[PDB]
Amino acid sequence: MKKIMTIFGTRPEAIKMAPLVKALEQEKMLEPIVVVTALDSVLSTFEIKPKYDLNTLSEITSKSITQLEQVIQLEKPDMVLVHGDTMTTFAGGLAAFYNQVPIGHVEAGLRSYDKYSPFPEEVNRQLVGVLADLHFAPTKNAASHLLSEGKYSESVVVTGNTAIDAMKYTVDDNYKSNIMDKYHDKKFILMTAHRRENIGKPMENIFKAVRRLIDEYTDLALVYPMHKNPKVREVAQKILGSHDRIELIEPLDVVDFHNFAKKSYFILTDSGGIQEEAPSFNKPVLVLRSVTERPEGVEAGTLKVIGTNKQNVYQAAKELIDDERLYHQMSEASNPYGDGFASERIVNHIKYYLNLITEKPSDFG
Amino acid sequence: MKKIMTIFGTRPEAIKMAPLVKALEQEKMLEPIVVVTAQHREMLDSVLSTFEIKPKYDLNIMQTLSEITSKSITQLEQVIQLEKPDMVLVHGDTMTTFAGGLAAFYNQVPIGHVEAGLRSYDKYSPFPEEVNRQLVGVLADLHFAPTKNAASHLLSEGKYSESVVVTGNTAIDAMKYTVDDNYKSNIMDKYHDKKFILMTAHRRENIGKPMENIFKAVRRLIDEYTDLALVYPMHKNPKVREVAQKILGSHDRIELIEPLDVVDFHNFAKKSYFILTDSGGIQEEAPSFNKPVLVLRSVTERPEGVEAGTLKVIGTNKQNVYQAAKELIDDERLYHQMSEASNPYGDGFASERIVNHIKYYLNLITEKPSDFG
Ligand SMILES: O=c1ccn([C@@H]2O[C@H](COP(=O)(O)OP(=O)(O)O)[C@@H](O)[C@H]2O)c(=O)[nH]1
Ligand SMILES: O=c1ccn([C@@H]2O[C@H](COP(=O)(O)OP(=O)(O)O)[C@@H](O)[C@H]2O)c(=O)[nH]1
């Protein structure tokens, strides 16, 4: 009945938007129109078929704006939903605004308050914050950023992060894997590293710290689904290669990654999405960054921001291994990012906003 | 020297940026690189000749709002990468302002926002200007706020304290260049025995009935008051002109004319009885001419002139426009209250303050200018 356009252009966004597309599909009064800019394995896992598959930073924005406008004018959606902070999020929000279509921002209000870090993500989410009619903040902290900036009180709602909802479709407590069977008698670290700010010396530092832990603790193993970057793979192979307790593998599909994460000892990562998922797996996370836009997990105790200095990475992981009570406290901390029903809240906020229902959902929480 | 790129694309924007380009020219340590995008093409040239400015780049851009933005960002990036400016200056809230600010940001060039912080706090009014100035507020490194009220909007939104500076509006600086001692006009001479209303209206007012309402209210005042006249420099839009002709045409004491060059418009505004307009720029200039303004907008981002007393916001309802104008005509005390009010928008030296803030920011000078106000 009411057309809800969902625009997304990356695999991490597809994971976060997929459960919302399923909730919009299940809702009788709303019809989702899926637009991919833009991944295929995520779309098949959640059984989503895009209606549109489109397809310098200036050229990306320029092309995205005009093509998304063509799709918006053809479909005439009642609302456009954009996610987070990528080039597509801003281009989709701006094309919607120019066509006077209401905008819902999924995962609204994250802030580093530094224009050049993350670049261009910090500016993208701040620019979308200007356009959006509804801000689906994942946490009360993100909602406070928007309320303090002067966004209208009633337009800011706390729903939780849809990353936790996606886990309901992927986790299988009877999951099977030959790599997991190989390390049945080991405690494995699950590591991922993709941030441009960690290319070069940060990566060498991280790998030497992890290699030292692998040498010192014989019952430890490492599973590292590596980004395809040839330089980082060369560096990974020199420090971490030819070791039977280290698995240097390709990126995992989301079913395999979530099930690996659920069996890991702890996670080492610079990922934003893994920080929101990890507390629901009861897995401590050591965040390989110097600044965070997810302080909620730090306050809850689920994560610890350790930077990329070789000594700090090594010492922080060693403390997690040696102090079982600290490990258990980080594992048991509740997820401040959601309870798995963010999509249902978002759907009911959309219905309320479009005058299809009288009840407005309460803030998650 | 440092390269200061000044990007602007419309005649109103050229009027406000021209005195700043002249101050950047006069400044020994800075070089202005003038980039014009020409959404307004013909009228933009007479502004450039009045102030003696020759653009280094003249891009042909100018179509949906998406297409304008899409074309402007890539072409302005090409100019930014070729020139490698030390700072990009954008003005106000047009499509060029945002596209130039975004291309500068993607190339990590510092951004100075001339006329920063105006807010209606309504996403669809002015559309797309309110959103454009809010989007540029996210990108800018220096916010040259025209008034303390505009600076308060930026400070309340969380912009860094030292990045927000009050300079006054460059619209008042431009009026120093539009004085013509040998000024004459045959239209003014024809109405030497009349009190004329000077009216201007944007093309967007003709989407729905606002323009028709305004014109019927004004025609009624011309019919009722024989000593009144109307001077209306019309946008070229054929649809605007059909509606003007159909309501205000074939009428004694009404001049339906072409857009005026800025020297004539400023000199017509000084001899008018009062101004009837939806213009943003005229609201900032009018107090310096001691002229009352009836603002044809439902929401304003210029409350300073309302507080000072030169401006009254009256909307576009036919009865309200007619009653508000009739009250100005009948109540000489109220006309006097709106006339003698001081200008809260500037003193004519905003450009010098902007230039010294730029020098300070790029570490060329130690003194930071004080806040105008
Ligand atoms: O090999 C991998 C690594 C990550 N993930 C998932 O991808 C998201 C995180 O993506 P990434 O770290 O690349 O991006 P970020 O979240 O930092 O933007 C989370 O949902 C992870 O569970 C995945 O499916 N396979
Ligand atoms: O025929 C005209 C009408 C206006 N102006 C000037 O143009 C600016 C206002 O332009 P406009 O109202 O079209 O745009 P706005 O300010 O509303 O964006 C002010 O400097 C006016 O003095 C002009 O030179 N000639």
mmCIF file of N, CA, C and O in Angstrom, chain A residues 56-59 61-62 65-66 69 87 90 94 97-98 100 113 115-116 119-120 123 126-127 130-131 133 148-149, chain B residues 64-67 69-70 73-74 77 95 98 102 105-106 108 123-124 127-128 131 134-135 138-139 141 156-157 160:
data_model
loop_
_atom_site.group_PDB
_atom_site.id
_atom_site.type_symbol
_atom_site.label_atom_id
_atom_site.label_comp_id
_atom_site.label_asym_id
_atom_site.label_seq_id
_atom_site.Cartn_x
_atom_site.Cartn_y
_atom_site.Cartn_z
ATOM 1 N N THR A 56 36.593 9.612 -8.481
ATOM 2 C CA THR A 56 36.680 10.520 -7.340
ATOM 3 C C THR A 56 35.396 10.460 -6.501
ATOM 4 O O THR A 56 34.373 9.935 -6.949
ATOM 5 N N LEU A 57 35.443 11.021 -5.293
ATOM 6 C CA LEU A 57 34.267 11.077 -4.415
ATOM 7 C C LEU A 57 33.181 11.930 -5.070
ATOM 8 O O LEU A 57 32.010 11.564 -5.008
ATOM 9 N N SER A 58 33.574 13.012 -5.780
ATOM 10 C CA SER A 58 32.648 13.882 -6.521
ATOM 11 C C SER A 58 31.913 13.098 -7.599
ATOM 12 O O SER A 58 30.704 13.244 -7.736
ATOM 13 N N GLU A 59 32.647 12.284 -8.384
ATOM 14 C CA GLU A 59 32.040 11.492 -9.459
ATOM 15 C C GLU A 59 31.093 10.447 -8.906
ATOM 16 O O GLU A 59 30.029 10.256 -9.472
ATOM 17 N N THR A 61 29.350 10.598 -6.056
ATOM 18 C CA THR A 61 28.172 11.337 -5.599
ATOM 19 C C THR A 61 27.355 11.842 -6.758
ATOM 20 O O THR A 61 26.138 11.726 -6.739
ATOM 21 N N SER A 62 28.026 12.424 -7.758
ATOM 22 C CA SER A 62 27.350 12.930 -8.953
ATOM 23 C C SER A 62 26.537 11.822 -9.656
ATOM 24 O O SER A 62 25.343 12.001 -9.896
ATOM 25 N N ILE A 65 23.522 10.402 -7.219
ATOM 26 C CA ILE A 65 22.400 11.341 -7.107
ATOM 27 C C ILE A 65 21.417 11.244 -8.299
ATOM 28 O O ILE A 65 20.220 11.105 -8.083
ATOM 29 N N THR A 66 21.911 11.379 -9.530
ATOM 30 C CA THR A 66 21.045 11.367 -10.714
ATOM 31 C C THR A 66 20.358 10.022 -10.914
ATOM 32 O O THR A 66 19.161 9.999 -11.155
ATOM 33 N N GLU A 69 17.707 9.515 -8.211
ATOM 34 C CA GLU A 69 16.553 10.379 -8.479
ATOM 35 C C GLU A 69 15.647 9.715 -9.537
ATOM 36 O O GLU A 69 14.435 9.742 -9.373
ATOM 37 N N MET A 87 28.669 6.827 0.782
ATOM 38 C CA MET A 87 28.397 7.775 -0.316
ATOM 39 C C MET A 87 26.946 7.624 -0.778
ATOM 40 O O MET A 87 26.283 8.626 -1.033
ATOM 41 N N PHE A 90 24.201 9.385 1.613
ATOM 42 C CA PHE A 90 23.998 10.813 1.383
ATOM 43 C C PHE A 90 23.349 11.063 0.021
ATOM 44 O O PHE A 90 22.412 11.849 -0.040
ATOM 45 N N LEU A 94 19.815 12.956 -0.416
ATOM 46 C CA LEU A 94 19.731 14.239 -1.147
ATOM 47 C C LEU A 94 18.749 14.151 -2.331
ATOM 48 O O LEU A 94 17.946 15.070 -2.524
ATOM 49 N N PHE A 97 15.296 14.253 -0.857
ATOM 50 C CA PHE A 97 14.991 15.627 -0.418
ATOM 51 C C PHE A 97 14.600 16.515 -1.596
ATOM 52 O O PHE A 97 13.604 17.230 -1.511
ATOM 53 N N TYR A 98 15.379 16.478 -2.685
ATOM 54 C CA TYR A 98 15.077 17.298 -3.870
ATOM 55 C C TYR A 98 13.714 16.957 -4.467
ATOM 56 O O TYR A 98 13.115 17.811 -5.130
ATOM 57 N N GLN A 100 11.163 15.969 -2.492
ATOM 58 C CA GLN A 100 10.247 16.160 -1.384
ATOM 59 C C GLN A 100 9.623 14.850 -0.873
ATOM 60 O O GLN A 100 8.451 14.831 -0.488
ATOM 61 N N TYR A 113 32.789 13.557 15.713
ATOM 62 C CA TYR A 113 32.942 15.012 15.798
ATOM 63 C C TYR A 113 34.316 15.472 15.230
ATOM 64 O O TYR A 113 34.837 16.530 15.591
ATOM 65 N N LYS A 115 35.713 15.959 11.340
ATOM 66 C CA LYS A 115 35.431 16.069 9.912
ATOM 67 C C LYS A 115 36.315 15.180 9.021
ATOM 68 O O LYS A 115 35.868 14.780 7.946
ATOM 69 N N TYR A 116 37.572 14.915 9.423
ATOM 70 C CA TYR A 116 38.479 14.090 8.616
ATOM 71 C C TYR A 116 38.710 12.695 9.173
ATOM 72 O O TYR A 116 39.582 11.996 8.670
ATOM 73 N N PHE A 119 36.786 9.667 7.261
ATOM 74 C CA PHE A 119 36.610 10.498 6.074
ATOM 75 C C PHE A 119 36.183 9.598 4.928
ATOM 76 O O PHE A 119 36.908 8.645 4.645
ATOM 77 N N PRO A 120 35.047 9.886 4.234
ATOM 78 C CA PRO A 120 34.085 10.985 4.415
ATOM 79 C C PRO A 120 32.874 10.601 5.286
ATOM 80 O O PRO A 120 31.911 11.366 5.291
ATOM 81 N N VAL A 123 31.237 13.266 7.979
ATOM 82 C CA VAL A 123 30.478 14.292 7.272
ATOM 83 C C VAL A 123 29.206 13.699 6.663
ATOM 84 O O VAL A 123 28.158 14.313 6.812
ATOM 85 N N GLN A 126 26.545 13.357 9.241
ATOM 86 C CA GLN A 126 26.097 14.697 9.682
ATOM 87 C C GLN A 126 25.229 15.344 8.584
ATOM 88 O O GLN A 126 24.202 15.929 8.903
ATOM 89 N N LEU A 127 25.597 15.175 7.295
ATOM 90 C CA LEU A 127 24.792 15.724 6.191
ATOM 91 C C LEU A 127 23.423 15.053 6.125
ATOM 92 O O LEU A 127 22.413 15.735 5.959
ATOM 93 N N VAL A 130 20.925 16.387 8.629
ATOM 94 C CA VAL A 130 20.229 17.620 8.233
ATOM 95 C C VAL A 130 18.948 17.300 7.437
ATOM 96 O O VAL A 130 17.936 17.972 7.599
ATOM 97 N N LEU A 131 19.010 16.314 6.542
ATOM 98 C CA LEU A 131 17.910 15.905 5.640
ATOM 99 C C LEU A 131 16.797 15.079 6.227
ATOM 100 O O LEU A 131 15.661 15.115 5.736
ATOM 101 N N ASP A 133 13.848 13.137 8.168
ATOM 102 C CA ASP A 133 12.578 13.433 8.848
ATOM 103 C C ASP A 133 12.435 12.557 10.077
ATOM 104 O O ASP A 133 11.780 12.964 11.027
ATOM 105 N N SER A 148 20.981 17.177 20.980
ATOM 106 C CA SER A 148 21.878 18.301 21.277
ATOM 107 C C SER A 148 22.168 19.191 20.065
ATOM 108 O O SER A 148 22.511 20.360 20.243
ATOM 109 N N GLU A 149 22.079 18.629 18.841
ATOM 110 C CA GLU A 149 22.292 19.396 17.612
ATOM 111 C C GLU A 149 21.041 20.193 17.233
ATOM 112 O O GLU A 149 21.118 21.001 16.322
ATOM 113 N N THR B 64 16.789 19.135 -13.364
ATOM 114 C CA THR B 64 16.364 18.868 -11.992
ATOM 115 C C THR B 64 17.416 19.387 -11.000
ATOM 116 O O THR B 64 18.546 19.704 -11.383
ATOM 117 N N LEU B 65 17.047 19.450 -9.717
ATOM 118 C CA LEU B 65 17.974 19.877 -8.667
ATOM 119 C C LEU B 65 19.134 18.884 -8.576
ATOM 120 O O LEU B 65 20.283 19.303 -8.433
ATOM 121 N N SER B 66 18.852 17.580 -8.770
ATOM 122 C CA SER B 66 19.870 16.521 -8.766
ATOM 123 C C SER B 66 20.885 16.749 -9.882
ATOM 124 O O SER B 66 22.080 16.626 -9.651
ATOM 125 N N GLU B 67 20.406 17.045 -11.100
ATOM 126 C CA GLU B 67 21.299 17.257 -12.249
ATOM 127 C C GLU B 67 22.164 18.492 -12.061
ATOM 128 O O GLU B 67 23.336 18.447 -12.383
ATOM 129 N N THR B 69 23.179 19.803 -9.152
ATOM 130 C CA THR B 69 24.174 19.433 -8.144
ATOM 131 C C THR B 69 25.204 18.496 -8.708
ATOM 132 O O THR B 69 26.397 18.675 -8.469
ATOM 133 N N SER B 70 24.745 17.470 -9.428
ATOM 134 C CA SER B 70 25.641 16.481 -10.024
ATOM 135 C C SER B 70 26.683 17.141 -10.958
ATOM 136 O O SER B 70 27.888 16.925 -10.795
ATOM 137 N N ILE B 73 29.214 19.749 -8.895
ATOM 138 C CA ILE B 73 30.244 19.123 -8.038
ATOM 139 C C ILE B 73 31.436 18.634 -8.873
ATOM 140 O O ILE B 73 32.573 18.902 -8.495
ATOM 141 N N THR B 74 31.197 17.897 -9.979
ATOM 142 C CA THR B 74 32.327 17.392 -10.777
ATOM 143 C C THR B 74 33.111 18.522 -11.449
ATOM 144 O O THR B 74 34.335 18.516 -11.389
ATOM 145 N N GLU B 77 35.056 20.489 -8.815
ATOM 146 C CA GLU B 77 36.208 19.707 -8.358
ATOM 147 C C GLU B 77 37.370 19.861 -9.362
ATOM 148 O O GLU B 77 38.506 20.024 -8.935
ATOM 149 N N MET B 95 22.381 26.280 -4.900
ATOM 150 C CA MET B 95 22.860 24.970 -5.327
ATOM 151 C C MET B 95 24.389 25.002 -5.470
ATOM 152 O O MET B 95 25.052 24.046 -5.082
ATOM 153 N N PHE B 98 26.390 24.741 -1.984
ATOM 154 C CA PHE B 98 26.580 23.400 -1.465
ATOM 155 C C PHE B 98 27.522 22.596 -2.360
ATOM 156 O O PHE B 98 28.418 21.946 -1.835
ATOM 157 N N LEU B 102 30.987 21.015 -1.035
ATOM 158 C CA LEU B 102 31.197 19.564 -1.024
ATOM 159 C C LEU B 102 32.440 19.157 -1.851
ATOM 160 O O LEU B 102 33.229 18.321 -1.404
ATOM 161 N N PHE B 105 35.436 20.050 0.229
ATOM 162 C CA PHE B 105 35.573 19.076 1.325
ATOM 163 C C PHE B 105 36.202 17.775 0.845
ATOM 164 O O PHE B 105 37.121 17.272 1.489
ATOM 165 N N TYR B 106 35.710 17.222 -0.276
ATOM 166 C CA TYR B 106 36.254 15.972 -0.817
ATOM 167 C C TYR B 106 37.735 16.108 -1.169
ATOM 168 O O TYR B 106 38.435 15.102 -1.168
ATOM 169 N N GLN B 108 39.783 18.129 0.609
ATOM 170 C CA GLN B 108 40.392 18.569 1.852
ATOM 171 C C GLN B 108 40.914 20.010 1.806
ATOM 172 O O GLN B 108 41.968 20.313 2.389
ATOM 173 N N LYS B 123 12.553 22.777 6.775
ATOM 174 C CA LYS B 123 13.162 22.049 5.660
ATOM 175 C C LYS B 123 12.562 22.373 4.289
ATOM 176 O O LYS B 123 13.261 22.257 3.284
ATOM 177 N N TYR B 124 11.267 22.723 4.224
ATOM 178 C CA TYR B 124 10.613 23.022 2.940
ATOM 179 C C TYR B 124 10.339 24.494 2.718
ATOM 180 O O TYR B 124 9.641 24.832 1.766
ATOM 181 N N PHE B 127 12.804 26.392 0.122
ATOM 182 C CA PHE B 127 13.209 25.123 -0.477
ATOM 183 C C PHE B 127 13.941 25.418 -1.784
ATOM 184 O O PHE B 127 13.343 26.083 -2.625
ATOM 185 N N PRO B 128 15.183 24.907 -1.996
ATOM 186 C CA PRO B 128 16.022 24.068 -1.096
ATOM 187 C C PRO B 128 17.009 24.871 -0.236
ATOM 188 O O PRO B 128 17.897 24.266 0.343
ATOM 189 N N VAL B 131 17.848 23.871 3.683
ATOM 190 C CA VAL B 131 18.709 22.683 3.736
ATOM 191 C C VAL B 131 20.115 23.002 3.236
ATOM 192 O O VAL B 131 21.073 22.607 3.889
ATOM 193 N N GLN B 134 22.133 24.685 5.879
ATOM 194 C CA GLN B 134 22.412 23.734 6.984
ATOM 195 C C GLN B 134 23.481 22.732 6.544
ATOM 196 O O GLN B 134 24.401 22.445 7.320
ATOM 197 N N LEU B 135 23.420 22.239 5.276
ATOM 198 C CA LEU B 135 24.436 21.302 4.775
ATOM 199 C C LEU B 135 25.818 21.961 4.717
ATOM 200 O O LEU B 135 26.816 21.353 5.106
ATOM 201 N N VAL B 138 27.631 22.170 8.041
ATOM 202 C CA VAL B 138 28.338 20.939 8.435
ATOM 203 C C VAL B 138 29.784 20.949 7.892
ATOM 204 O O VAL B 138 30.701 20.501 8.575
ATOM 205 N N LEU B 139 29.969 21.439 6.664
ATOM 206 C CA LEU B 139 31.261 21.399 5.958
ATOM 207 C C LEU B 139 32.234 22.501 6.314
ATOM 208 O O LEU B 139 33.433 22.273 6.227
ATOM 209 N N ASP B 141 34.767 25.449 7.701
ATOM 210 C CA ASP B 141 35.830 25.623 8.700
ATOM 211 C C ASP B 141 35.703 26.986 9.354
ATOM 212 O O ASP B 141 36.105 27.137 10.494
ATOM 213 N N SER B 156 24.698 27.273 18.946
ATOM 214 C CA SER B 156 23.712 26.337 19.522
ATOM 215 C C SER B 156 23.695 24.964 18.853
ATOM 216 O O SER B 156 23.307 23.974 19.487
ATOM 217 N N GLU B 157 24.103 24.892 17.567
ATOM 218 C CA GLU B 157 24.172 23.623 16.848
ATOM 219 C C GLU B 157 25.454 22.860 17.175
ATOM 220 O O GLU B 157 25.581 21.715 16.758
ATOM 221 N N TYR B 160 32.280 24.814 16.434
ATOM 222 C CA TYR B 160 33.352 25.250 17.323
ATOM 223 C C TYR B 160 33.374 26.776 17.502
ATOM 224 O O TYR B 160 33.351 27.524 16.520
#
